[PDB]
Structures are given as structure tokens and as C-alpha cells.
């Protein structure tokens with residue numbers, strides 16, 4: 120009776136196994152755009168993905184993960200709110216059963232169809248596992264997805280999903296360039312938060328881009344054909360794998376623009 124997204128194990132239940140669910144810096148949050156304050160001291164984010172080396176795509180049960188080589192300093196995220204160098208190691212998405220829901224963060228209560236998370240660990244902690252135990256160990260770049268025109272750079276992800284339909288399946292996924300998932304602008308909001316699902320560690324600097332990307336209905340529809348279950352178990356479509364917005368508590372959201 121493991122955690123998930125259903126009635127019987129979803130977000131309202133997680134605090135029993137993971138009490139930090141009720142912590143002081145949980146994610147996601149609603150981004151109140153009128154209250155987020157431009158911070159002229161923030162830097163223009165540096166997203167350097169030219170040398171990224173994707174490895175594999177894995178159905179982890181609650182999502183799929185695209186994993187990268189994080190054994191040498193390749194793709195990194197720096198600048199903005201960050202002190203030091205964060206190494207890209209994985210991306211994944213959250214999405215809905217319907218185009219009108221799926222994002223974790225919201226913008227003035229608006230929900231997007233999906234949200235892309237590019238996860239990076241702070242190289243000063245040596246490993247991902249070490250980093251995850253630090254309040255500045257991770258930086259996650261969040262990008263909203265709206266349904267409209269297709270995103271060319273997403274299609275290779277969509278097309279491999281039939282090969283990893285069920286929990287525990289993996290496929291080779293080399294030579295994928297995550298630069299094809301980024302919007303034109305790097306304007307962002309930032310705040311201190313957490314992993315958005317168990318174990319909910321309070322280890323993340325969130326950087327949420329203002330500009331969504333456009334994906335087609337057919338692209339998101341293929342995400343909704345994935346399965347939460349393993350092969351040979353009853354089929355449960357992998358949809359609505361988002362945590363709702365959590366209390367902001369003692370935090371300020373800071374804007375890089377305007």
C-alpha cells in the first residue's frame with residue numbers, strides 16, 4: 120500500500136509515511152504573479168545543455184524518467200538564484216487526464232496541461248544522493264506545457280513511450296537533446312521548495328519559466344496511454360500524476376523579469 124495519486128494513497132495520504140508533507144517549504148505552489156517581486160539582483164539563468172548525454176527512459180510507475188550521464192560535468196544549470204553548478208541528470212513530466220489540468224505549479228490559479236521538470240544536483244555535494252539531503256542540493260527547472268501546436272523536440276519522447284508502457288520497463292534513449300524542450304525566453308520565477316512527491320525532501324531551488332511550450336493534443340494524449348501498473352497487473356492509466364499547490368507559508372516568490 121505504497122503512495123500514489125489515487126483516492127486511497129494520493130497527496131492527502133502522503134503525510135502519514137512522509138510527515139514533511141506538511142513542512143515549511145513544500146512544493147508545488149501557486150505563483151501569484153502580482154505578488155512575486157522582480158528581483159534585480161537575480162541573474163540571467165545559464166542553461167548549458169550542449170554536451171548533454173541522454174542514456175535511458177524508464178517507467179518509474181508514477182511517471183517516466185529520461186536519465187542522463189551525470190558522471191562528468193556536462194550539462195549544467197547555473198546562474199539565477201543559484202550559487203555554484205548544478206548537473207542535469209534527469210527530466211520527467213506531470214500531466215492530466217484532461218487538457219485543463221496536469222501542471223503542479225499554477226500561475227494565478229491557472230493550470231496547464233502538463234509540466235516538465237529538468238532535475239539537476241549541486242556538484243558541490245559530489246553525488247545525487249548526498250545532494251538530496253541538503254537544502255540547496257537540487258535545482259529543478261520547471262516548464263509549463265499548453266496544448267496547441269506540436270513541439271518537434273518532444274516527438275522522440277512520445278514515440279518511445281509504447282516501449283515502456285508499464286512500470287519497470289526501460290528503453291535505450293541516447294542522443295536526445297533537451298534543448299528542444301525549452302521555450303524561447305528564460306524569464307522565471309524562483310522560490311525554495313521540495314520534491315513534489317515522496318519522499319518530499321526539502322532540497323530544491325525551484326526555477327519555473329514564465330513562457331510555456333506548446334505541445335499537440337496528440338502528444339499529450341500519448342502520455343496518457345502509459346500505465347501506472349506493472350506488466351501483468353490490472354491496467355491503470357498514468358494520468359493526473361500531479362500534486363496540487365501547497366501552502367506558501369513563510370516564502371517569497373521572486374521574479375527575474377519586469
Ligand SMILES: NS(=O)(=O)c1c(F)c(F)c(S(=O)(=O)CCO)c(NCc2ccccc2)c1F
Pocket residue numbers: 179184186208209246247248249
Ligand atoms: N531517475 S532518477 O535519476 O531521478 C532517480 C530516481 F528516480 C530515483 F527514484 C532514485 S532512488 O535511488 O532514490 C529510489 C529508487 O526508486 C535515484 N537514485 C540515485 C542516487 C542515489 C544515491 C547517490 C547517487 C544517486 C535516481 F537517480
Ligand SMILES: NS(=O)(=O)c1c(F)c(F)c(S(=O)(=O)CCO)c(NCc2ccccc2)c1F
Pocket residue numbers: 179209236238247251257259313314315316317318319323
Ligand atoms: N517532481 S520533482 O522534480 O520534485 C521530483 C520528485 F518529486 C521526486 F520525488 C523525485 S525522486 O526520484 O525522489 C522520486 C521519484 O521521482 C525526483 N527525481 C529526481 C531526484 C532523484 C533523487 C533525489 C532527488 C531528486 C524529482 F525530480
Ligand SMILES: [Zn+2]
Pocket residue numbers: 211212213236315
Ligand atoms: Zn516533477
